[PDB]
Amino acid sequence: DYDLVVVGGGIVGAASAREIVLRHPSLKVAVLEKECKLAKHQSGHNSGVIHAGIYYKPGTLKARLCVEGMHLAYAYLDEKKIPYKKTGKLIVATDEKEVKLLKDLEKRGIANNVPDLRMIEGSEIQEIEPYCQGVMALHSPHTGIVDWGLVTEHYGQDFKQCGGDIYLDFNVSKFTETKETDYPVTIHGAKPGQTVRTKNVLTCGGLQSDLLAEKTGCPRDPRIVPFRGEYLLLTKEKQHMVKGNIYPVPDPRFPFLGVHFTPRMDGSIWLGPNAVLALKREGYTWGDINLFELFDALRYPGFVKMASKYIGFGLSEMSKSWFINLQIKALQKYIPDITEYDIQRGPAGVRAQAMDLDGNLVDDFVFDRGQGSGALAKRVLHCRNAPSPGATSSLAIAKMIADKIENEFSIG
Amino acid sequence: DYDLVVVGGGIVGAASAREIVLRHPSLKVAVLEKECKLAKHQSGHNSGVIHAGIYYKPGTLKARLCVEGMHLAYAYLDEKKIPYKKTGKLIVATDEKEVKLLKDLEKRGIANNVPDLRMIEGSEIQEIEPYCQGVMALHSPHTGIVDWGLVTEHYGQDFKQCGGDIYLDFNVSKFTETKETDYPVTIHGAKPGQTVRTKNVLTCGGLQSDLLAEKTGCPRDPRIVPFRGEYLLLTKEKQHMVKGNIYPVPDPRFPFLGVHFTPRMDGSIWLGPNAVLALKREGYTWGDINLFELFDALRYPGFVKMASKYIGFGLSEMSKSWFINLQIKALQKYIPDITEYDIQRGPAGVRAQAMDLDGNLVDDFVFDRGQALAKRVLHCRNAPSPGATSSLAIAKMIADKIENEFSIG
Amino acid sequence: GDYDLVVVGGGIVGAASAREIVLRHPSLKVAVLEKECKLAKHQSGHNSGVIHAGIYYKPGTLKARLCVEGMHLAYAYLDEKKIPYKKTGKLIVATDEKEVKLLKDLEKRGIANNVPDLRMIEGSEIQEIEPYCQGVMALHSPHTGIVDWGLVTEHYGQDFKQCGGDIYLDFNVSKFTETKTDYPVTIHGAKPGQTVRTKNVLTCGGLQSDLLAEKTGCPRDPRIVPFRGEYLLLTKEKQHMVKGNIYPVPDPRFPFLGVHFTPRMDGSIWLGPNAVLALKREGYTWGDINLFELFDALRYPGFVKMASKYIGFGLSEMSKSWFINLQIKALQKYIPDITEYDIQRGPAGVRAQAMDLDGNLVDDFVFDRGQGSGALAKRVLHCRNAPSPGATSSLAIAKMIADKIENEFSIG
Amino acid sequence: GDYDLVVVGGGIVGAASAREIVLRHPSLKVAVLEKECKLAKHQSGHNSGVIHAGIYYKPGTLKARLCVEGMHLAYAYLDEKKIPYKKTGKLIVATDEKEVKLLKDLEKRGIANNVPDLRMIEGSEIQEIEPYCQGVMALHSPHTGIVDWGLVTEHYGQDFKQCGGDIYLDFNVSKFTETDYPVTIHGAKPGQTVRTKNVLTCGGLQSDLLAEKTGCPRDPRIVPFRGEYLLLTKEKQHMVKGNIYPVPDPRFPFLGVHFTPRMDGSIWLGPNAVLALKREGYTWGDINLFELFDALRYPGFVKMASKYIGFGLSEMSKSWFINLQIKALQKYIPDITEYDIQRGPAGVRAQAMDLDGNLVDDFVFDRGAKRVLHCRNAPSPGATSSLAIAKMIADKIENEFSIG
Ligand SMILES: Cc1cc2nc3c(=O)[nH]c(=O)nc-3n(C[C@H](O)[C@H](O)[C@H](O)COP(=O)(O)OP(=O)(O)OC[C@H]3O[C@@H](n4cnc5c(N)ncnc54)[C@H](O)[C@@H]3O)c2cc1C
Ligand SMILES: Cc1cc2nc3c(=O)[nH]c(=O)nc-3n(C[C@H](O)[C@H](O)[C@H](O)COP(=O)(O)OP(=O)(O)OC[C@H]3O[C@@H](n4cnc5c(N)ncnc54)[C@H](O)[C@@H]3O)c2cc1C
Ligand SMILES: Cc1cc2nc3c(=O)[nH]c(=O)nc-3n(C[C@H](O)[C@H](O)[C@H](O)COP(=O)(O)OP(=O)(O)OC[C@H]3O[C@@H](n4cnc5c(N)ncnc54)[C@H](O)[C@@H]3O)c2cc1C
Ligand SMILES: Cc1cc2nc3c(=O)[nH]c(=O)nc-3n(C[C@H](O)[C@H](O)[C@H](O)COP(=O)(O)OP(=O)(O)OC[C@H]3O[C@@H](n4cnc5c(N)ncnc54)[C@H](O)[C@@H]3O)c2cc1C
Ligand SMILES: CCCCCCCCCCCCO[C@@H]1O[C@H](CO)[C@@H](O[C@H]2O[C@H](CO)[C@@H](O)[C@H](O)[C@H]2O)[C@H](O)[C@H]1O
Ligand SMILES: CCCCCCCCCCCCO[C@@H]1O[C@H](CO)[C@@H](O[C@H]2O[C@H](CO)[C@@H](O)[C@H](O)[C@H]2O)[C@H](O)[C@H]1O
Ligand SMILES: CCCCCCCCCCCCO[C@@H]1O[C@H](CO)[C@@H](O[C@H]2O[C@H](CO)[C@@H](O)[C@H](O)[C@H]2O)[C@H](O)[C@H]1O
Ligand SMILES: CCCCCCCCCCCCO[C@@H]1O[C@H](CO)[C@@H](O[C@H]2O[C@H](CO)[C@@H](O)[C@H](O)[C@H]2O)[C@H](O)[C@H]1O
Structure with missing residues (x-):
């Protein structure tokens, strides 16, 4: 039936499947989504902000992916003519205690090459925002807004235009080994007789990534809170x-x-x-x-x-x-x-x-596969966490995920 | 925009909207469904059984609706070539105290003209179910199985083929007297600027039929439990x-x-x-x-x-x-x-x-309307069981009600 | 000081046992510790007040004899202390033929248990005993009576105190320690400085018998529910x-x-x-x-x-x-x-x-002690459960417990 | 079983009030009912044991006076009955400049309440009283002390019994009825009753529940x-x-x-x-x-x-x-x-x-059966001001019931 199946029709699952079919046009790829539309959850209930990459530690992958994805996003929005507005961002400090951290954000912003970052105070705050108080403000004019749910829908349309299959109303409930076939993994939905067979699986299940990873044999950690x-x-x-x-x-x-x-x-x-x-x-x-x-x-x-x-x-x-x-x-x-x-x-x-088990909030890439022998192991990779902000870095995250499953599944 | 709008994309809402556009091919009718597809709730999470009408009291509307709807359904499944199976049914009794209740069901089923209801002794049970025990059983050979969700979707396509509009992702949240106009009732969704104008509204909101009725001015009872x-x-x-x-x-x-x-x-x-x-x-x-x-x-x-x-x-x-x-x-x-x-x-x-207030499990039609919005919004707060099997017959009943209530045709 | 034996628990079982022991051994220095500010504030003071005859219990068991003997011991004690009681009688009424089969099973166990004057009554004879009561058959126990078991418990205590025994009300036993030599066990109350030392301890802690038993190293089972x-x-x-x-x-x-x-x-x-x-x-x-x-x-x-x-x-x-x-x-x-x-x-x-760990409602005697050879494991005996019915069987339970600690502690 | 006055509640407030009224009127047959099998089982037996001096309270109010007078009456009572106490001074320590201004407010209020011998104490001076304590400034109240308020409450009850008062422990007041002595009080045990002409309630954590038994509004509620x-x-x-x-x-x-x-x-x-x-x-x-x-x-x-x-x-x-x-x-x-x-x-x-969310810290008296008065609240700190609170409650009882 399929060479690769992507479980999860959010912005991360859609951008991943879209990036994969664009690199490998002969790969038969499907997307399974438990809801009846893409971007029903995290990708459709967000701030709609296109982040520029200010807060993130310089030299890290997180700082790189946000600046990467932001430019890739604006380029993609222009290519597909998706509406957006570059409204600009003001990070406002209210007392001198917040200017010590505000200056640290300015250093991080410049080191991450955030475009046109400039510090601001006094009457200049009311030039950009006439109703806003504050001791000192950080100005990022390239921070914009967009409907990330609409962007996710365009990812799915691009995915379909390359021959990809999107199964809505497909609630992945269990993985089983196919009978002794060239597609050794069958994916079962919640509806009786709803199945899909495949060679390899990637899951991008957002709020249920840990639960999806357990059905392959992965540890309970990291848990999604x-x-x-x-x-x-x-x-x-x-x-x-x-x-x-x-x-x-x-x-x-x-x-x-x-x-x-x-x-x-x-x-x-x-x-x-x-x-x-x-x-x-x-x-x-x-x-x-x-x-x-x-x-x-x-x-x-x-x-x-x-x-x-x-x-x-x-x-x-x-x-x-x-x-x-x-x-x-x-x-x-x-x-x-x-x-x-x-x-x-x-x-x-x-x-x-x-x-994780220590109580730290994981912000890194976390890929996981089961501990079997084994058909459901080795062939089912779970993206249990992607760096934030996932919508802004989605196109850059997709290239990392495309590289990961290429090395994990020997594709291309 | 529309003459009539049916709120509810379940099997009862879709069948009624389909029945009324077939009776009046000139009526501008729309369907509002808060979810992204039809049959997301009761109509898509059921046992998938085509009931024969055995248990229901003879002479009541409920008894007529189930036997008639069962016949209308099988005709519709053949008409649309929808897959189904006439698996048959056995109502097995396990002791003699259950036998007396079973004999009552046989009298009701024969009075309801369930074809072809027969009582079989415990020895004959294994001729139909080789692994099943029991001292006596009621045999309904024409009880069937079907995907009522797929049937609900076919109702909607029939509704669409006749000229009806289906608004998915329309979470009805407020009814409003239209400001100016020939469409006095406005329906507001959950999103800004999501409105539809109409002359009359019929709601079939299933698990939220009482909350929908409250938005017109209807009492909190009967409550959906x-x-x-x-x-x-x-x-x-x-x-x-x-x-x-x-x-x-x-x-x-x-x-x-x-x-x-x-x-x-x-x-x-x-x-x-x-x-x-x-x-x-x-x-x-x-x-x-x-x-x-x-x-x-x-x-x-x-x-x-x-x-x-x-x-x-x-x-x-x-x-x-x-x-x-x-x-x-x-x-x-x-x-x-x-x-x-x-x-x-x-x-x-x-x-x-x-x-209701007295703790009774209501099992018949309940229509309700306010004391503008009072005369033009009719709420079906309950329909007789089983809703899926009797859907085509229930819709004929409901079309009769809104035809008299709204003077349609 | 202080004492040779300490009984923890001011209920009807702890008081009767402490009363029985000082009567058997007038020279033994015994004390009773009770956490409440009065005796019989719990089970012994919140009961049906019934003096049971011993009908339901399995013949040959110790439970069957303790209730028949305890009932005869109780009436003799009530007359001796002039405690008011009433032999009202008991009617065990069956309403259908299924309960009739269970009733004659009860009658035969009652006859085997030597329950006095037990007579199976039938039909219209029921209204001669209870004019307003109905039924198809009833078992009549004329010697089943009523009494204030709480008042009985306080009478056990005054008997205990009259024989030289000490009663420590408001003494919430918190921990047992080794007296690092004439009285190797030290008992600690809730308030600091509230201690008592002894050679051996018996606990009859009712609703907290398992919690008391854990304090000297016994398992959590059987647990009190x-x-x-x-x-x-x-x-x-x-x-x-x-x-x-x-x-x-x-x-x-x-x-x-x-x-x-x-x-x-x-x-x-x-x-x-x-x-x-x-x-x-x-x-x-x-x-x-x-x-x-x-x-x-x-x-x-x-x-x-x-x-x-x-x-x-x-x-x-x-x-x-x-x-x-x-x-x-x-x-x-x-x-x-x-x-x-x-x-x-x-x-x-x-x-x-x-x-117990298997889910059985234990209804027999359960004793327990520590799993070593030190002072706490050897000198503290816990009665985790007394057979039903405890109030009726109290005087008979006391003699069994008195026999038990006489062997375990070499008393006398 | 028949009394002129019955006090429901064997805490420090109920015991001190029953003691105060029998000292004023030695011929008054008075009893106290307590649902527990001992006095001072609750608030009076689970407190900080501190004898407060009257620092925090607003000058001129009834709170500031009752605490200062109460602590003087307390110390005299402890000496008279030879009840142990220690008199370990208090130190209210400020740790930042934003706390020294509020501490100066407590000093002005403390001297206005005539707390002896209150003195503002500076940072270097703190270690002379508490060597291990930090702080930029502190307020020194050397006459604040410690005591077992439960033992004090039991001494009130003994004074009450010595004057002829009856203490009914294990008496859980459950119902008031019309019965001479027109008020009958029922306990939780069978046949447990007393009769009286008037009732005073000092039920602490159940004061609002007792007030309901006679038909008073549910407010103020005890949280x-x-x-x-x-x-x-x-x-x-x-x-x-x-x-x-x-x-x-x-x-x-x-x-x-x-x-x-x-x-x-x-x-x-x-x-x-x-x-x-x-x-x-x-x-x-x-x-x-x-x-x-x-x-x-x-x-x-x-x-x-x-x-x-x-x-x-x-x-x-x-x-x-x-x-x-x-x-x-x-x-x-x-x-x-x-x-x-x-x-x-x-x-x-x-x-x-109260119904507006305010934490009530003043006297609250509630009449119903018009012979039942409920003290639904007494000003803080109840233990330190107990003997002063009792005199006020005695005045209210004498005017509400016309005793004397
Ligand atoms: C409140 C909020 C505000 C945000 N604001 C911003 C912002 O301004 N800018 C920004 O860049 N980022 C923002 N983000 C981050 C961004 O929304 C997420 O990083 C991104 O949507 C993650 O996409 P995802 O596909 O991994 O998750 P999701 O969008 O939730 O996708 C997971 C999908 O998997 C499906 N699924 C789950 N289990 C199964 C199963 N068993 N079978 C089939 N399908 C299944 C779910 O139905 C869902 O559609 C915000 C996030 C939140 C929560
Ligand atoms: C467990 C179960 C098993 C069953 N098995 C059988 C069986 O074997 N045979 C049989 O004949 N019957 C069976 N039934 C009965 C049958 O499923 C129902 O009677 C029938 O589906 C009722 O249809 P409905 O449209 O009224 O309900 P629903 O399908 O619940 O329709 C209600 C619809 O209204 C929508 N809605 C609610 N509020 C709003 C709003 N504000 N705006 C817009 N849309 C809104 C909801 O999204 C929903 O789609 C079963 C029912 C259950 C619960
Ligand atoms: C509702 C009910 C009805 C009953 N009716 C009858 C009847 O009609 N006839 C009949 O014969 N029997 C009857 N019984 C049974 C009888 O009441 C009990 O079997 C018996 O009273 C239990 O005696 P006990 O002293 O072991 O328990 P308890 O009376 O509970 O005594 C245990 C005592 O130990 C104290 N204690 C616990 N922990 C500590 C500690 N750490 N330190 C100090 N003290 C502690 C407790 O405060 C308590 O006073 C009834 C029981 C119940 C519950
Ligand atoms: C944690 C804490 C620390 C404190 N520290 C201090 C401190 O350092 N200094 C200080 O001065 N004050 C202190 N106090 C305040 C002081 O303890 C109380 O203000 C005081 O004890 C109030 O006395 P009371 O009798 O009104 O309350 P209680 O002592 O609770 O008396 C109420 C009594 O009424 C009885 N009762 C209730 N309902 C019934 C009924 N239906 N029938 C019969 N009897 C009934 C109860 O059994 C109880 O004994 C502290 C309070 C608390 C809670
Ligand atoms: C397991 C239960 C425990 C929960 C686990 C820990 C939860 C931690 C939550 C992190 C808090 C969310 O993020 C927090 O948002 C608040 C509110 O805007 C920010 O607060 C900031 O902005 C607000 C206004 O928005 C100002 O009034 C405030 O003075 C300023 O500090 C914090 O700087 C930021 O840290
Ligand atoms: C809201 C709180 C209170 C709840 C209100 C009351 C709820 C009413 C629920 C009625 C019970 C559901 O329906 C009930 O199903 C059970 C289980 O199959 C049937 O039970 C029958 O079949 C089962 C097998 O399934 C046999 O084991 C059983 O001996 C037989 O009686 C009952 O005959 C029927 O009455
Ligand atoms: C912790 C979760 C699980 C709970 C554990 C199981 C608890 C079991 C408790 C047993 C029930 C108490 O004991 C049970 O009392 C009922 C009610 O009186 C008796 O019932 C009997 O007398 C009552 C009247 O009193 C009649 O209406 C009834 O027809 C008859 O059977 C049962 O014969 C007896 O077995
Ligand atoms: C019903 C739900 C809502 C609850 C209602 C509101 C409850 C309010 C409770 C008031 C708080 C108790 O009292 C509060 O105690 C804290 C802690 O000691 C004091 O706090 C003070 O001492 C502590 C240490 O003891 C210092 O670390 C702190 O910097 C200082 O402010 C507050 O000054 C006092 O106000």
């Missing part, structure tokens, strides 16, 4: 208050960039996302929990270790979500004239945050 | 032990038919469905809990009343679900050589069980 | 409808006798007790949950095995407890003119039900 | 706040000599986790203020579903939570993870580690809350 990213909607009567992206100076101990003011493609102004621990892999709303997710995430050895040191930051995120009057006061340090009457609760996304 | 229906997967090494449908003798006090043996179009044998109270409206996943949906299901004044009488039967369902060994012990009364190692927990559906 | 026993009160206007004890025919697979009609000493008629799994060791109130004692009742290996067979029997007890109307319908099989409006919710007790 | 203590190892008890208190947030009635010696020489660290999920929830795992539902559904709860949830979560997190509590304590005693502390006992504060 869901972090809900909630957004607030600024009222249309005050959408003029922000023009581009206004980011805070975040704590560099964590990969999160903090709650930020970001315009959407349709003109809306979204405030977020935050980082509240979800009690469900797809916990898009508060109170939508899964008890197996609760009992297993709390008993995961890495969980207690991270909470032992960073319980305060997580509780502060949840408290500011429970009572948005605490959130708007944090937002008034940047835009003071926003009140509780100007914001409403908006939609949310869920980060697939990888975590 | 979700009942999870779990399925067990039998290994292929024992699939040969079940030829057709093997059903137990159920308690006539409830609308549930019990955990049964049923082949899929796959040929694989599924054991179910369950009848476990769900802690979430769309609680397909086992441990999924919604605190709002659970606290509202338990604070509903009808919940404590029905639980005060029948919580024992509900508790027996969950313990057999918690401990599969107890469910295996029950199924061995029919197929003895099946152990716990022969099964695996499979997917589940969620029944949209309507319930 | 708490079963709340709830009672309902009949309105005074209908007390006349119940003259004596009216019991149902129980399932012999379980130690529990069913919900029964029992008059109290003040003329009250109590309906109970049931057998509902407590979510807390001392869970006398519904809703009182202890996360530790709950999460360790489950996850205990014997629990899931026991539930995998009998979960339905426990849930029916719960369903009738939550919905009193379901309990009244079952009680109407015996007394029909009793409605839901005629009853009130009353107090509850909690059974200290021992459970 | 339980568990107060956990940590135990310093014996090897480092020499590192603190007396009370070492921090500079607390003046918006709340809590004084914060502090270093405090006990009568046996032990050093206890606490108490914190974590929301308990049970009225008598002395341990973290011990919760009550009913006494969790209603505390959340109480209209005042979410109002206070919407403003100060961060302070409650900070308390809980430091309780869940000891390392975070140690880092806070190291600002005062730097050379202690997790190996130097162990988890200790806990108390539960009967914190009264």
